[PDB]
């Protein structure tokens, strides 16, 4: 019960073929390329500014998100116990 | 800690007041517009009935190799691959389950008739020893 | 490209050294959570069975 | 039409359906597994009724036969 | 990860359904038994209204990562929304340079007519005086 | 459009590829308009030094005409 999204998604899974992305940026060639050069410069700037924020930003968060994942995990195993305890009781009852 | 629709770790979790279960806002907002009821309990639920729960901007750090280039090309491609091949595989899991249930029931019936047939057989054989 | 990507590679390798360890740390946690969510359903299913 | 910001908005809108579909598909998946599990358990449970019943029926035969 | 009332790591988290916030069951239970209210917003809340944290249901999740499709899409918003501000830094600075260039080229065009007349007048004064 | 989805992947690739160059071309033009502006400021201040010597040659001429 979805729009166009479902038609191309089901076709991609049935055919077993992922849609091709931009295989351009990585290769390139020295000596149109004035644009390609200026795109590279800006890209690098973004990465570097972004990378710099990310290290410092990453450094600040590099482990703050890891703590959240431990709070998320322990909650699941508490429910594993709560389910374990009910079922055991039921089994015991049946046995008796 | 997770969403009860997609299997996400929500960025803006919101709880419904009819059935205490945390959903990601976008996915619960979509369900209410499709059919105005709670997805799990099938109880009457609206967009105003929801209650947002503070998350204080869930930790998602940006990778060291983060640029406009991979985020446009490689990362966004993988996200619509992972959405496509999962729901297709999830649609494959529904039907299988249904079929399984059906056949299970079918097999189960055949044994009931054997027991009912043997319940008349045994006690009358025991009764004949009594006679 | 020279100035920025050299800074990026320095920022990346400095982050990577600190964060590839924290990535591995994070990945494991995620996997564990996933597994747990898998045991949760089998116990709920078996609870409703029993 | 061929801009940029709304393409990402469109990508969200189609994903919003993807999640809603995966939910209803999973509900029926697990809800059918409950019927599968309750049946298979109750089947092999009802199967042990026969094993018991067959051996008692058998005991009634040699008893009456030898008498 | 934290309890908002005490500030500890809660060992039994239960989320309320009036002010969405993760409280420790043993702490919030005593807050409700004191008076039937939610500690933050002071809205009415009972113990049955409070709900423990649970595994969603039957769909299996994975932890929040950079791979995950939704986290990758919200990443590309950050990319473009930051690059859109990068364009303002160059659009706003261009409107100062071209505005200073416009007044500079006007002062150049207003001045060079006076250089042309002094080159005329100083040579005309040398043409006039030398002949006499 | 009805448009194939594998193609929509390569569109978003091309559109990010285009915006990266449409941001680059707009920045090198800003640097060269400021650079060519700085070449005008040197000529502006160099010209008003050359007018001072030309005024002296006119002042020297007005003294000789009087004599």
Nearest to C30 by CA among F2, E110, D15, A72: A72
Instruction: Report yes or no: E12 at the A interface, CB cutoff 8 Å.
Output: yes
Asked if the Cβ–Cβ distance from D7 to F15 is below 8 Å, we say yes
Asked if the Cβ–Cβ distance from A79 to E54 is below 8 Å, we say yes
Asked if the Cβ–Cβ distance from C30 to E60 is below 8 Å, we say no
How was this structure obtained? cryo-EM
Do B39 and B31 contact (CB within 8 A), yes or no? yes
Domain count, chain D: 1
Judging contacts by C-beta atoms under 8 Å, the chain E residues touching residue D11 are 73
Q: Is E80 buried (19+), middle (13-18) or exposed (0-12) by CB count in 10 A?
A: middle
Spatial neighbors of D1 by CB under 8 A, at least 6 apart, are: none
Q: What is the resolution of this structure in A?
A: 2.9
Judging contacts by C-beta atoms under 8 Å, the chain C residues touching residue A38 are none
Instruction: Report yes or no: A93 at the C interface, CB cutoff 8 Å.
Output: no
Asked if the Cβ–Cβ distance from D41 to C49 is below 8 Å, we say yes
Reduced to 3 states (helix: H, G, I; strand: E, B; else coil), residue B13 is strand
In whole angstroms, what separates CA A14 from the centre of its chain?
23
Specify the DSSP class assigned to residue D17. Answer: H
Asked if the Cβ–Cβ distance from C30 to E65 is below 8 Å, we say yes
Judging contacts by C-beta atoms under 8 Å, the chain C residues touching residue D41 are 49
Instruction: Calculate the dihedral angle through the C-alpha atoms of B76, C34, B29, B38, rounding to the nearest 10 degrees.
Output: 160
The tokens describing D41, both together, are 């358990």
Instruction: Please state, in angstroms and rounded to a whole number, the distance separating the CA atoms of residues B72 and B80.
Output: 12
The tokens describing A14, both together, are 């049935």
Judging contacts by C-beta atoms under 8 Å, the chain C residues touching residue B40 are none
Indicate if the alpha-carbon torsion angle B59, B64, B66, B71 is positive or negative.
Answer: negative
Q: Is E35 left (phi over 0), alpha (psi -120 to 50) or beta?
A: beta
Q: Is E91 buried (19+), middle (13-18) or exposed (0-12) by CB count in 10 A?
A: exposed
Residue D63, domain extent: 1-67
């Amino acid at each position: 019960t979805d729009i166009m999204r479902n038609e191309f998604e089901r076709l991609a899974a049935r055919q077993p073929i992922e849609l091709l992305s931009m295989k351009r940026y990585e290769l390139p060639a020295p000596s149109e390329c004035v644009n390609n050069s200026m795109a590279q410069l800006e890209h690098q700037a973004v990465r570097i500014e972004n990378l710099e924020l990310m290290s410092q930003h990453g450094c600040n968060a590099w482990k703050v998100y890891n703590e959240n994942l431990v709070h998320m995990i322990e909650h699941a195993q508490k429910e594993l116990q709560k389910l374990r305890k009910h079922i055991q009781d039921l089994n015991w009852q049946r046995k008796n | 800690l997770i969403c009860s629709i997609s299997n996400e770790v929500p960025e803006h979790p919101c709880v419904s007041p009819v059935s205490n279960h945390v959903y990601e806002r976008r996915l619960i907002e979509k369900y209410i517009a499709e059919n105005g009821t709670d997805p799990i309990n099938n109880q009457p639920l609206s967009e105003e009935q929801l209650i947002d729960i503070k998350v204080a901007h869930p930790i998602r750090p940006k990778p060291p190799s983060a640029t406009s280039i991979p985020a446009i090309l490689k990362a966004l491609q993988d996200e619509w691959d992972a959405v496509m091949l999962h729901s297709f595989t999830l649609r494959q899991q529904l039907q299988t389950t249904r079929q399984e249930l059906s056949h299970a029931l079918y097999q189960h019936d055949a044994a009931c008739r054997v027991i009912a047939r043997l319940t008349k057989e045994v006690t009358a054989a025991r009764e004949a020893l009594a006679t | 490209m020279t100035t920025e990507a050299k800074r990026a590679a320095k920022m990346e390798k400095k982050m990577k050294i600190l964060l590839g360890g924290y990535q591995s740390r994070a990945m494991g946690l995620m996997k564990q959570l996933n597994d747990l969510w898998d045991q949760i359903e089998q116990a709920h299913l078996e609870l409703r069975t029993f």
